[PDB]
Ligand SMILES: CC(C)(C)NC(=O)Nc1ccc2nccnc2c1
Protein backbone atom coordinates (compact mmCIF):
# COMPACT_ATOMS: atom_id res chain seq x y z
CA UNK A 1 0.00 0.00 0.00
CA UNK A 2 1.73 3.28 1.35
CA UNK A 3 2.87 5.08 4.62
CA UNK A 4 2.57 8.64 6.04
CA UNK A 5 5.83 10.68 6.34
CA UNK A 6 7.75 10.39 9.64
CA UNK A 7 7.44 14.21 10.25
CA UNK A 8 3.60 14.07 10.12
CA UNK A 9 3.46 10.87 12.26
CA UNK A 10 5.77 12.62 14.76
CA UNK A 11 3.07 15.29 15.46
CA UNK A 12 -0.24 13.59 14.46
CA UNK A 13 -2.13 10.26 14.94
CA UNK A 14 -3.98 9.61 11.60
CA UNK A 15 -7.58 8.26 11.51
CA UNK A 16 -10.74 7.73 9.27
CA UNK A 17 -11.63 9.51 5.97
CA UNK A 18 -13.22 13.05 6.32
CA UNK A 19 -8.44 13.46 -0.09
CA UNK A 20 -9.36 14.44 3.58
CA UNK A 21 -8.60 12.41 6.76
CA UNK A 22 -9.29 12.92 10.49
CA UNK A 23 -6.18 13.14 12.71
CA UNK A 24 -5.28 13.94 16.32
CA UNK A 25 -2.61 16.46 17.29
CA UNK A 26 -0.37 14.57 19.80
CA UNK A 27 0.40 17.77 21.80
CA UNK A 28 -3.25 18.73 22.43
CA UNK A 29 -5.25 15.48 21.81
CA UNK A 30 -7.49 17.71 19.68
CA UNK A 31 -9.13 16.69 16.40
CA UNK A 32 -7.72 18.16 13.14
CA UNK A 33 -8.34 17.55 9.42
CA UNK A 34 -5.52 16.49 7.08
CA UNK A 35 -5.90 17.30 3.32
CA UNK A 36 -3.67 14.99 1.17
CA UNK A 37 -2.78 16.36 -2.33
CA UNK A 38 -0.94 14.13 -4.91
CA UNK A 39 2.54 15.36 -6.06
CA UNK A 40 0.48 25.91 -7.03
CA UNK A 41 -0.07 24.23 -3.57
CA UNK A 42 2.73 26.47 -2.14
CA UNK A 43 0.82 29.59 -3.38
CA UNK A 44 -2.40 28.23 -1.75
CA UNK A 45 -0.42 27.80 1.57
CA UNK A 46 0.99 31.38 1.21
CA UNK A 47 -2.57 32.68 0.53
CA UNK A 48 -4.09 30.73 3.51
CA UNK A 49 -1.33 31.77 6.00
CA UNK A 50 -1.87 35.50 5.17
CA UNK A 51 -5.73 35.52 5.45
CA UNK A 52 -7.37 35.88 8.88
CA UNK A 53 -11.22 35.74 8.84
CA UNK A 54 -13.71 33.56 10.84
CA UNK A 55 -15.39 32.41 7.57
CA UNK A 56 -12.14 31.39 5.83
CA UNK A 57 -10.39 28.02 6.72
CA UNK A 58 -7.10 28.29 8.69
CA UNK A 59 -4.03 26.21 7.92
CA UNK A 60 -2.56 24.75 11.16
CA UNK A 61 0.49 22.97 9.61
CA UNK A 62 2.00 21.84 6.27
CA UNK A 63 4.13 18.86 5.09
CA UNK A 64 5.92 18.68 1.71
CA UNK A 65 6.94 15.00 1.27
CA UNK A 66 5.91 12.25 -1.31
CA UNK A 67 2.55 14.09 -1.34
CA UNK A 68 1.37 17.40 0.15
CA UNK A 69 -0.18 17.20 3.64
CA UNK A 70 -2.22 20.21 4.79
CA UNK A 71 -3.39 20.33 8.43
CA UNK A 72 -6.63 22.34 8.78
CA UNK A 73 -9.16 23.05 11.54
CA UNK A 74 -11.76 20.21 11.62
CA UNK A 75 -15.32 21.09 10.48
CA UNK A 76 -17.75 18.71 12.15
CA UNK A 77 -20.74 19.70 9.92
CA UNK A 78 -18.96 18.71 6.73
CA UNK A 79 -19.82 20.08 3.29
CA UNK A 80 -22.77 22.36 2.43
CA UNK A 81 -23.17 20.04 -0.62
CA UNK A 82 -24.44 17.23 1.69
CA UNK A 83 -27.26 19.59 2.90
CA UNK A 84 -28.45 20.51 -0.66
CA UNK A 85 -27.90 17.23 -2.65
CA UNK A 86 -30.89 15.51 -4.29
CA UNK A 87 -33.55 18.30 -4.21
CA UNK A 88 -32.98 18.83 -0.42
CA UNK A 89 -33.60 22.47 0.54
CA UNK A 90 -32.68 24.64 3.53
CA UNK A 91 -35.27 26.84 5.30
CA UNK A 92 -34.91 30.48 4.12
CA UNK A 93 -33.46 31.70 7.48
CA UNK A 94 -30.64 29.09 7.31
CA UNK A 95 -29.86 30.17 3.67
CA UNK A 96 -29.54 33.74 4.99
CA UNK A 97 -27.27 32.91 7.95
CA UNK A 98 -24.95 30.82 5.68
CA UNK A 99 -25.06 33.24 2.68
CA UNK A 100 -24.35 36.27 4.89
CA UNK A 101 -21.12 34.53 6.04
CA UNK A 102 -20.21 33.54 2.40
CA UNK A 103 -20.65 37.25 1.52
CA UNK A 104 -18.45 38.45 4.44
CA UNK A 105 -15.79 35.79 3.55
CA UNK A 106 -15.79 36.70 -0.20
CA UNK A 107 -15.84 40.46 0.60
CA UNK A 108 -12.72 39.93 2.84
CA UNK A 109 -11.01 38.01 -0.02
CA UNK A 110 -11.70 40.81 -2.60
CA UNK A 111 -10.62 43.56 -0.11
CA UNK A 112 -7.33 41.55 0.25
CA UNK A 113 -6.83 41.09 -3.54
CA UNK A 114 -7.82 37.38 -3.77
CA UNK A 115 -10.40 35.81 -6.16
CA UNK A 116 -11.41 32.24 -5.14
CA UNK A 117 -12.55 31.12 -8.68
CA UNK A 118 -14.02 27.82 -7.45
CA UNK A 119 -16.97 28.67 -5.12
CA UNK A 120 -19.41 25.65 -4.90
CA UNK A 121 -21.38 23.97 -2.03
CA UNK A 122 -18.52 21.30 -1.95
CA UNK A 123 -16.04 24.11 -0.87
CA UNK A 124 -18.30 25.54 1.90
CA UNK A 125 -17.84 23.75 5.26
CA UNK A 126 -20.17 23.86 8.29
CA UNK A 127 -18.61 24.05 11.80
CA UNK A 128 -21.18 21.77 13.55
CA UNK A 129 -23.88 19.12 12.95
CA UNK A 130 -26.36 21.91 14.06
CA UNK A 131 -28.41 24.06 11.57
CA UNK A 132 -27.25 27.38 13.08
CA UNK A 133 -23.45 27.24 12.76
CA UNK A 134 -20.39 29.07 11.47
CA UNK A 135 -19.46 28.38 7.87
CA UNK A 136 -15.95 28.42 6.36
CA UNK A 137 -14.78 28.74 2.73
CA UNK A 138 -12.15 26.16 1.67
CA UNK A 139 -10.24 24.87 -1.52
CA UNK A 140 -8.08 27.89 -2.56
CA UNK A 141 -6.30 25.78 -5.25
CA UNK A 142 -7.84 27.75 -8.17
CA UNK A 143 -7.50 31.12 -6.43
CA UNK A 144 -5.77 34.08 -8.17
CA UNK A 145 -3.88 37.10 -6.74
CA UNK A 146 -4.81 40.57 -8.14
CA UNK A 147 -0.92 44.08 -13.74
CA UNK A 148 0.68 43.85 -17.25
CA UNK A 149 -2.10 46.10 -18.71
CA UNK A 150 -1.36 49.01 -16.30
CA UNK A 151 2.39 48.86 -17.25
CA UNK A 152 1.45 48.84 -21.01
CA UNK A 153 -0.89 51.86 -20.55
CA UNK A 154 2.02 53.99 -19.22
CA UNK A 155 3.65 54.22 -22.69
CA UNK A 156 2.44 55.62 -26.05
CA UNK A 157 0.26 53.00 -27.82
CA UNK A 158 1.85 53.63 -31.25
CA UNK A 159 2.54 49.84 -31.55
CA UNK A 160 -0.29 48.69 -29.23
CA UNK A 161 -2.83 46.13 -30.70
CA UNK A 162 -6.55 47.16 -30.68
CA UNK A 163 -7.78 44.15 -28.64
CA UNK A 164 -5.57 45.36 -25.74
CA UNK A 165 -7.15 48.84 -25.80
CA UNK A 166 -10.62 47.14 -26.08
CA UNK A 167 -9.91 44.99 -22.95
CA UNK A 168 -9.38 48.21 -20.85
CA UNK A 169 -13.22 48.45 -20.63
CA UNK A 170 -13.63 45.14 -18.72
CA UNK A 171 -10.23 44.97 -16.87
CA UNK A 172 -10.28 44.60 -13.09
CA UNK A 173 -13.71 42.83 -12.93
CA UNK A 174 -12.40 39.22 -12.55
CA UNK A 175 -13.71 39.22 -8.93
CA UNK A 176 -17.25 39.37 -10.39
CA UNK A 177 -16.91 35.58 -11.21
CA UNK A 178 -17.10 34.88 -7.40
CA UNK A 179 -20.38 36.86 -7.24
CA UNK A 180 -21.84 34.80 -10.08
CA UNK A 181 -20.93 31.52 -8.19
CA UNK A 182 -22.49 32.89 -4.98
CA UNK A 183 -25.58 33.70 -7.05
CA UNK A 184 -25.78 30.01 -8.19
CA UNK A 185 -25.05 28.77 -4.58
CA UNK A 186 -27.92 30.95 -3.24
CA UNK A 187 -30.30 29.61 -5.99
CA UNK A 188 -29.44 25.97 -5.09
CA UNK A 189 -29.80 26.52 -1.31
CA UNK A 190 -33.23 28.27 -1.63
CA UNK A 191 -34.75 25.90 -4.29
CA UNK A 192 -32.93 22.53 -3.88
CA UNK A 193 -32.34 22.56 -7.68
CA UNK A 194 -29.62 24.10 -9.99
CA UNK A 195 -30.40 27.23 -12.11
CA UNK A 196 -28.52 25.88 -15.16
CA UNK A 197 -28.59 22.13 -16.04
CA UNK A 198 -28.89 19.59 -18.85
CA UNK A 199 -31.83 17.81 -17.06
CA UNK A 200 -35.11 18.08 -19.09
CA UNK A 201 -33.85 20.84 -21.51
CA UNK A 202 -32.97 21.26 -25.23
CA UNK A 203 -30.86 24.41 -24.64
CA UNK A 204 -27.09 23.72 -24.09
CA UNK A 205 -25.59 24.47 -20.64
CA UNK A 206 -23.25 27.02 -22.39
CA UNK A 207 -26.30 28.79 -23.97
CA UNK A 208 -28.33 28.92 -20.70
CA UNK A 209 -25.35 30.56 -18.88
CA UNK A 210 -24.39 33.10 -21.59
CA UNK A 211 -28.06 34.14 -22.05
CA UNK A 212 -28.48 34.18 -18.23
CA UNK A 213 -31.83 32.35 -18.65
CA UNK A 214 -32.08 30.33 -15.40
CA UNK A 215 -34.66 27.58 -15.04
CA UNK A 216 -37.50 29.12 -12.98
CA UNK A 217 -40.01 26.62 -11.45
CA UNK A 218 -42.84 28.72 -9.85
CA UNK A 219 -44.11 25.86 -7.56
CA UNK A 220 -40.65 25.57 -5.92
CA UNK A 221 -40.04 29.38 -5.62
CA UNK A 222 -43.54 30.26 -4.26
CA UNK A 223 -42.27 28.91 -0.88
CA UNK A 224 -39.32 31.41 -1.06
CA UNK A 225 -39.65 35.20 -0.37
CA UNK A 226 -39.51 37.83 -3.18
CA UNK A 227 -36.51 39.57 -1.40
CA UNK A 228 -34.31 36.41 -1.62
CA UNK A 229 -35.26 35.91 -5.33
CA UNK A 230 -34.46 39.63 -6.05
CA UNK A 231 -30.89 39.12 -4.67
CA UNK A 232 -30.44 35.93 -6.84
CA UNK A 233 -31.62 37.94 -9.92
CA UNK A 234 -29.06 40.73 -9.11
CA UNK A 235 -26.13 38.25 -8.76
CA UNK A 236 -27.14 36.20 -11.86
CA UNK A 237 -26.55 39.21 -14.21
CA UNK A 238 -24.61 38.34 -17.46
CA UNK A 239 -22.70 41.71 -17.61
CA UNK A 240 -19.92 41.48 -14.91
CA UNK A 241 -19.79 45.31 -14.71
CA UNK A 242 -23.54 45.44 -13.84
CA UNK A 243 -23.49 42.30 -11.53
CA UNK A 244 -23.88 42.91 -7.75
CA UNK A 245 -20.69 43.06 -5.71
CA UNK A 246 -20.40 41.52 -2.20
CA UNK A 247 -20.96 45.10 -0.76
CA UNK A 248 -24.15 45.60 -2.84
CA UNK A 249 -25.40 42.10 -1.81
CA UNK A 250 -24.61 42.92 1.89
CA UNK A 251 -26.67 46.20 1.58
CA UNK A 252 -29.63 44.34 -0.10
CA UNK A 253 -32.98 44.32 1.87
CA UNK A 254 -32.76 40.50 2.18
CA UNK A 255 -29.69 40.76 4.43
CA UNK A 256 -31.04 43.74 6.45
CA UNK A 257 -32.04 41.21 9.20
CA UNK A 258 -30.99 42.09 12.79
CA UNK A 259 -32.03 38.62 14.07
CA UNK A 260 -29.76 36.69 11.63
CA UNK A 261 -26.82 39.12 12.32
CA UNK A 262 -27.28 38.51 16.12
CA UNK A 263 -27.31 34.65 15.70
CA UNK A 264 -24.01 34.93 13.73
CA UNK A 265 -22.35 37.23 16.38
CA UNK A 266 -23.51 34.67 19.02
CA UNK A 267 -21.84 31.74 17.13
CA UNK A 268 -18.67 33.92 16.90
CA UNK A 269 -18.66 34.64 20.69
CA UNK A 270 -19.20 30.87 21.38
CA UNK A 271 -16.27 29.87 19.07
CA UNK A 272 -13.99 32.68 20.41
CA UNK A 273 -14.73 31.76 24.14
CA UNK A 274 -12.01 29.03 24.06
CA UNK A 275 -9.23 31.37 22.73
CA UNK A 276 -10.21 34.57 24.73
CA UNK A 277 -7.24 36.13 26.65
CA UNK A 278 -8.23 38.53 29.55
CA UNK A 279 -8.26 42.19 28.55
CA UNK A 280 -7.36 45.68 29.81
CA UNK A 281 -10.54 47.38 31.16
CA UNK B 282 29.24 58.08 -8.15
CA UNK B 283 29.15 54.14 -8.31
CA UNK B 284 31.32 51.02 -9.18
CA UNK B 285 30.79 47.79 -11.21
CA UNK B 286 30.68 44.48 -9.22
CA UNK B 287 34.01 42.66 -8.72
CA UNK B 288 32.66 39.51 -10.53
CA UNK B 289 31.90 41.50 -13.74
CA UNK B 290 35.23 43.41 -13.55
CA UNK B 291 36.98 40.04 -13.12
CA UNK B 292 35.81 38.92 -16.63
CA UNK B 293 35.15 42.22 -18.50
CA UNK B 294 36.79 45.64 -19.16
CA UNK B 295 33.89 48.20 -19.26
CA UNK B 296 33.78 51.04 -21.86
CA UNK B 297 31.53 53.75 -23.55
CA UNK B 298 27.67 53.87 -23.68
CA UNK B 299 26.00 51.65 -26.41
CA UNK B 300 21.18 51.25 -20.02
CA UNK B 301 23.69 49.63 -22.53
CA UNK B 302 27.54 49.82 -22.38
CA UNK B 303 30.37 48.44 -24.55
CA UNK B 304 32.75 46.01 -22.79
CA UNK B 305 35.64 43.69 -23.66
CA UNK B 306 35.77 40.04 -22.60
CA UNK B 307 39.25 39.65 -20.97
CA UNK B 308 39.59 36.00 -22.17
CA UNK B 309 38.99 36.74 -25.88
CA UNK B 310 39.63 40.54 -26.24
CA UNK B 311 36.32 40.53 -28.12
CA UNK B 312 33.68 43.28 -27.95
CA UNK B 313 30.44 42.54 -26.01
CA UNK B 314 27.42 44.61 -24.94
CA UNK B 315 26.45 44.93 -21.26
CA UNK B 316 22.75 45.76 -20.45
CA UNK B 317 22.42 47.30 -16.93
CA UNK B 318 18.92 46.98 -15.31
CA UNK B 319 18.11 48.80 -11.98
CA UNK B 320 17.18 46.55 -8.98
CA UNK B 321 10.95 39.32 -14.04
CA UNK B 322 14.62 39.76 -15.24
CA UNK B 323 15.30 36.11 -14.14
CA UNK B 324 12.39 34.93 -16.39
CA UNK B 325 13.84 37.00 -19.30
CA UNK B 326 17.27 35.26 -18.70
CA UNK B 327 15.51 31.82 -18.59
CA UNK B 328 13.64 32.70 -21.85
CA UNK B 329 16.86 33.97 -23.60
CA UNK B 330 19.02 30.95 -22.52
CA UNK B 331 16.43 28.49 -23.97
CA UNK B 332 15.93 30.21 -27.39
CA UNK B 333 18.41 29.52 -30.22
CA UNK B 334 17.73 31.47 -33.47
CA UNK B 335 20.02 33.73 -35.61
CA UNK B 336 17.45 36.59 -35.42
CA UNK B 337 17.04 36.47 -31.62
CA UNK B 338 19.73 38.05 -29.28
CA UNK B 339 21.91 35.59 -27.30
CA UNK B 340 22.81 36.08 -23.65
CA UNK B 341 26.56 35.43 -23.11
CA UNK B 342 26.64 35.96 -19.29
CA UNK B 343 24.60 37.30 -16.34
CA UNK B 344 25.40 39.11 -13.03
CA UNK B 345 22.91 39.56 -10.16
CA UNK B 346 24.47 42.21 -7.84
CA UNK B 347 23.38 45.82 -6.80
CA UNK B 348 21.85 45.94 -10.32
CA UNK B 349 21.33 43.31 -13.04
CA UNK B 350 24.14 43.01 -15.61
CA UNK B 351 23.31 41.15 -18.85
CA UNK B 352 26.17 40.34 -21.27
CA UNK B 353 24.91 40.14 -24.88
CA UNK B 354 26.47 39.83 -28.34
CA UNK B 355 27.41 43.33 -29.62
CA UNK B 356 25.35 44.70 -32.55
CA UNK B 357 27.47 47.22 -34.45
CA UNK B 358 24.53 48.60 -36.52
CA UNK B 359 22.59 49.66 -33.44
CA UNK B 360 18.81 50.15 -33.36
CA UNK B 361 16.45 50.00 -36.36
CA UNK B 362 14.85 53.13 -34.75
CA UNK B 363 17.94 55.21 -35.74
CA UNK B 364 17.34 54.23 -39.44
CA UNK B 365 13.62 55.27 -39.43
CA UNK B 366 13.57 58.35 -37.08
CA UNK B 367 12.42 61.73 -38.44
CA UNK B 368 10.67 60.72 -41.71
CA UNK B 369 13.78 58.71 -42.84
CA UNK B 370 12.75 55.73 -44.99
CA UNK B 371 14.47 52.50 -46.07
CA UNK B 372 14.45 51.35 -49.73
CA UNK B 373 11.77 48.64 -50.23
CA UNK B 374 14.35 45.80 -50.67
CA UNK B 375 15.97 46.63 -47.28
CA UNK B 376 12.47 46.64 -45.61
CA UNK B 377 11.97 43.14 -47.07
CA UNK B 378 15.33 41.72 -45.95
CA UNK B 379 14.80 43.08 -42.38
CA UNK B 380 11.05 42.21 -42.18
CA UNK B 381 11.64 38.66 -43.44
CA UNK B 382 14.06 38.13 -40.50
CA UNK B 383 11.57 39.76 -38.00
CA UNK B 384 8.96 37.27 -39.33
CA UNK B 385 11.31 34.24 -38.95
CA UNK B 386 12.31 35.43 -35.42
CA UNK B 387 8.65 35.99 -34.32
CA UNK B 388 7.54 32.70 -35.96
CA UNK B 389 10.29 30.87 -33.94
CA UNK B 390 9.07 32.60 -30.73
CA UNK B 391 5.39 31.55 -31.31
CA UNK B 392 6.43 27.95 -32.27
CA UNK B 393 8.30 27.89 -28.89
CA UNK B 394 5.35 29.33 -26.88
CA UNK B 395 6.74 32.88 -26.35
CA UNK B 396 4.96 36.20 -27.13
CA UNK B 397 7.35 39.22 -27.15
CA UNK B 398 4.62 41.89 -26.41
CA UNK B 399 6.98 44.83 -27.00
CA UNK B 400 8.03 44.75 -30.71
CA UNK B 401 9.20 48.27 -31.84
CA UNK B 402 12.10 49.58 -34.03
CA UNK B 403 13.97 50.36 -30.68
CA UNK B 404 14.03 46.53 -29.93
CA UNK B 405 15.30 45.49 -33.41
CA UNK B 406 19.13 45.56 -33.67
CA UNK B 407 21.25 45.53 -36.85
CA UNK B 408 24.46 43.43 -36.90
CA UNK B 409 26.57 45.89 -38.98
CA UNK B 410 26.82 49.53 -40.16
CA UNK B 411 25.98 48.07 -43.67
CA UNK B 412 22.45 48.17 -45.24
CA UNK B 413 22.38 44.40 -45.96
CA UNK B 414 22.87 42.82 -42.52
CA UNK B 415 21.46 40.33 -40.04
CA UNK B 416 18.87 41.69 -37.64
CA UNK B 417 18.20 40.50 -34.07
CA UNK B 418 15.14 40.94 -31.81
CA UNK B 419 15.95 42.14 -28.25
CA UNK B 420 14.18 43.37 -24.96
CA UNK B 421 12.25 40.27 -23.76
CA UNK B 422 11.28 42.05 -20.48
CA UNK B 423 7.54 42.20 -21.39
CA UNK B 424 7.50 38.71 -22.91
CA UNK B 425 4.92 36.09 -21.79
CA UNK B 426 5.06 32.25 -21.75
CA UNK B 427 2.02 30.37 -23.22
CA UNK B 428 -3.74 27.61 -18.98
CA UNK B 429 -6.35 28.26 -16.19
CA UNK B 430 -9.19 28.26 -18.81
CA UNK B 431 -8.36 24.73 -20.09
CA UNK B 432 -8.42 23.39 -16.45
CA UNK B 433 -11.81 25.15 -15.84
CA UNK B 434 -13.29 23.66 -19.07
CA UNK B 435 -12.62 20.09 -17.80
CA UNK B 436 -15.41 20.33 -15.18
CA UNK B 437 -19.19 20.93 -15.43
CA UNK B 438 -19.86 24.71 -15.73
CA UNK B 439 -22.82 24.62 -13.29
CA UNK B 440 -21.14 27.46 -11.28
CA UNK B 441 -19.13 28.94 -14.19
CA UNK B 442 -19.64 32.72 -14.93
CA UNK B 443 -20.80 33.66 -18.49
CA UNK B 444 -17.85 35.97 -19.28
CA UNK B 445 -15.52 32.94 -18.89
CA UNK B 446 -17.53 30.90 -21.42
CA UNK B 447 -17.60 34.02 -23.72
CA UNK B 448 -13.76 34.34 -23.54
CA UNK B 449 -13.39 30.76 -24.99
CA UNK B 450 -14.03 32.32 -28.46
CA UNK B 451 -10.88 34.53 -28.39
CA UNK B 452 -8.59 32.41 -26.10
CA UNK B 453 -5.17 31.43 -27.45
CA UNK B 454 -4.82 34.44 -29.84
CA UNK B 455 -2.54 36.61 -27.61
CA UNK B 456 0.33 35.98 -30.10
CA UNK B 457 -1.65 38.05 -32.65
CA UNK B 458 -0.48 41.23 -30.74
CA UNK B 459 3.09 40.57 -32.10
CA UNK B 460 1.67 40.48 -35.66
CA UNK B 461 -0.06 43.82 -35.14
CA UNK B 462 3.30 45.39 -33.93
CA UNK B 463 5.11 43.91 -36.96
CA UNK B 464 2.37 45.45 -39.11
CA UNK B 465 3.11 48.92 -37.58
CA UNK B 466 6.94 48.33 -37.88
CA UNK B 467 6.52 47.47 -41.61
CA UNK B 468 4.35 50.64 -42.15
CA UNK B 469 7.03 52.86 -40.50
CA UNK B 470 9.94 51.29 -42.43
CA UNK B 471 8.19 51.61 -45.85
CA UNK B 472 6.75 55.17 -45.34
CA UNK B 473 9.05 56.89 -42.77
CA UNK B 474 5.88 57.89 -40.84
CA UNK B 475 3.67 56.15 -38.16
CA UNK B 476 0.21 54.72 -39.11
CA UNK B 477 -1.42 55.97 -35.88
CA UNK B 478 -0.40 59.34 -34.31
CA UNK B 479 -1.66 62.51 -32.64
CA UNK B 480 0.17 64.73 -35.22
CA UNK B 481 -2.30 66.78 -37.37
CA UNK B 482 -5.46 64.78 -36.33
CA UNK B 483 -8.70 65.30 -34.31
CA UNK B 484 -9.30 61.54 -33.81
CA UNK B 485 -7.80 60.12 -30.54
CA UNK B 486 -4.91 57.61 -30.81
CA UNK B 487 -7.19 55.04 -29.02
CA UNK B 488 -9.96 55.60 -31.66
CA UNK B 489 -7.59 55.34 -34.68
CA UNK B 490 -6.25 51.96 -33.37
CA UNK B 491 -9.61 50.38 -32.40
CA UNK B 492 -11.18 51.45 -35.73
CA UNK B 493 -8.00 50.30 -37.56
CA UNK B 494 -8.12 53.52 -39.64
CA UNK B 495 -4.41 54.15 -40.38
CA UNK B 496 -3.26 57.48 -41.79
CA UNK B 497 -2.76 56.88 -45.54
CA UNK B 498 -0.72 59.56 -47.41
CA UNK B 499 -0.87 58.66 -51.17
CA UNK B 500 2.22 60.79 -52.13
CA UNK B 501 4.41 58.81 -49.68
CA UNK B 502 2.98 55.33 -50.58
CA UNK B 503 3.07 55.82 -54.41
CA UNK B 504 6.86 55.14 -54.13
CA UNK B 505 6.06 51.78 -52.39
CA UNK B 506 4.79 48.63 -54.24
CA UNK B 507 1.14 47.41 -53.97
CA UNK B 508 2.40 43.95 -52.66
CA UNK B 509 4.12 45.54 -49.60
CA UNK B 510 1.00 47.68 -48.84
CA UNK B 511 -1.24 44.54 -49.17
CA UNK B 512 0.85 42.77 -46.44
CA UNK B 513 0.59 45.88 -44.14
CA UNK B 514 -3.24 45.88 -44.68
CA UNK B 515 -3.39 42.13 -43.75
CA UNK B 516 -1.37 42.62 -40.51
CA UNK B 517 -3.24 45.83 -39.50
CA UNK B 518 -6.58 43.93 -39.15
CA UNK B 519 -8.60 44.83 -35.96
CA UNK B 520 -9.98 41.24 -35.42
CA UNK B 521 -7.03 39.18 -33.97
CA UNK B 522 -8.66 35.94 -35.26
CA UNK B 523 -8.68 37.33 -38.85
CA UNK B 524 -5.18 39.04 -38.59
CA UNK B 525 -2.30 37.43 -40.56
CA UNK B 526 -0.02 35.09 -38.65
CA UNK B 527 3.78 34.98 -39.18
CA UNK B 528 3.21 31.86 -41.45
CA UNK B 529 0.59 33.69 -43.57
CA UNK B 530 2.91 36.76 -43.83
CA UNK B 531 5.85 34.44 -44.83
CA UNK B 532 3.63 32.88 -47.62
CA UNK B 533 2.53 36.37 -48.89
CA UNK B 534 3.60 37.30 -52.50
CA UNK B 535 5.74 40.18 -51.11
CA UNK B 536 8.11 37.73 -49.41
CA UNK B 537 8.18 35.27 -52.36
CA UNK B 538 11.56 36.84 -53.39
CA UNK B 539 14.43 34.39 -54.13
CA UNK B 540 16.98 37.25 -54.32
CA UNK B 541 16.23 38.58 -50.78
CA UNK B 542 16.21 34.97 -49.36
CA UNK B 543 19.68 34.37 -50.97
CA UNK B 544 21.15 37.65 -49.51
CA UNK B 545 19.94 36.53 -46.03
CA UNK B 546 21.43 32.97 -46.39
CA UNK B 547 24.70 34.68 -47.50
CA UNK B 548 24.78 36.91 -44.33
CA UNK B 549 24.13 33.72 -42.28
CA UNK B 550 27.05 31.81 -43.95
CA UNK B 551 29.34 34.88 -43.38
CA UNK B 552 28.38 35.10 -39.63
CA UNK B 553 28.61 31.27 -39.15
CA UNK B 554 32.12 31.08 -40.87
CA UNK B 555 33.86 32.02 -37.57
CA UNK B 556 32.12 29.26 -35.48
CA UNK B 557 32.13 26.46 -38.19
CA UNK B 558 33.58 23.12 -36.90
CA UNK B 559 34.75 20.64 -39.67
CA UNK B 560 32.15 18.04 -40.58
CA UNK B 561 31.73 14.36 -41.49
CA UNK B 562 31.49 14.04 -45.32
C1 LIG C 1 -19.75 15.53 8.59
C2 LIG C 1 -18.80 14.46 8.05
C3 LIG C 1 -19.60 13.42 7.28
C4 LIG C 1 -18.08 13.79 9.21
N1 LIG C 1 -17.84 15.05 7.09
C5 LIG C 1 -16.87 15.97 7.35
O1 LIG C 1 -16.65 16.47 8.46
N2 LIG C 1 -16.17 16.28 6.21
C6 LIG C 1 -15.11 17.21 6.02
C7 LIG C 1 -14.57 17.29 4.74
C8 LIG C 1 -13.53 18.13 4.47
C9 LIG C 1 -12.97 18.94 5.48
N3 LIG C 1 -11.94 19.80 5.20
C10 LIG C 1 -11.52 20.56 6.19
C11 LIG C 1 -12.08 20.51 7.47
N4 LIG C 1 -13.06 19.69 7.79
C12 LIG C 1 -13.53 18.88 6.78
C13 LIG C 1 -14.60 18.00 7.04
Ligand SMILES: CC(C)(C)NC(=O)Nc1ccc2nccnc2c1
Nearest residue numbers: 299301314353354355356357358359
Ligand atom coordinates in the same frame (compact mmCIF):
# COMPACT_ATOMS: atom_id res chain seq x y z
C1 LIG D 1 25.55 51.96 -33.72
C2 LIG D 1 25.78 52.56 -32.34
C3 LIG D 1 25.46 54.05 -32.38
C4 LIG D 1 27.23 52.36 -31.92
N1 LIG D 1 24.85 51.96 -31.35
C5 LIG D 1 24.81 50.66 -30.94
O1 LIG D 1 25.57 49.77 -31.33
N2 LIG D 1 23.82 50.48 -30.01
C6 LIG D 1 23.41 49.28 -29.35
C7 LIG D 1 22.36 49.41 -28.43
C8 LIG D 1 21.93 48.32 -27.72
C9 LIG D 1 22.52 47.05 -27.91
N3 LIG D 1 22.06 45.97 -27.21
C10 LIG D 1 22.63 44.81 -27.48
C11 LIG D 1 23.64 44.67 -28.43
N4 LIG D 1 24.12 45.70 -29.11
C12 LIG D 1 23.56 46.92 -28.85
C13 LIG D 1 24.00 48.05 -29.57
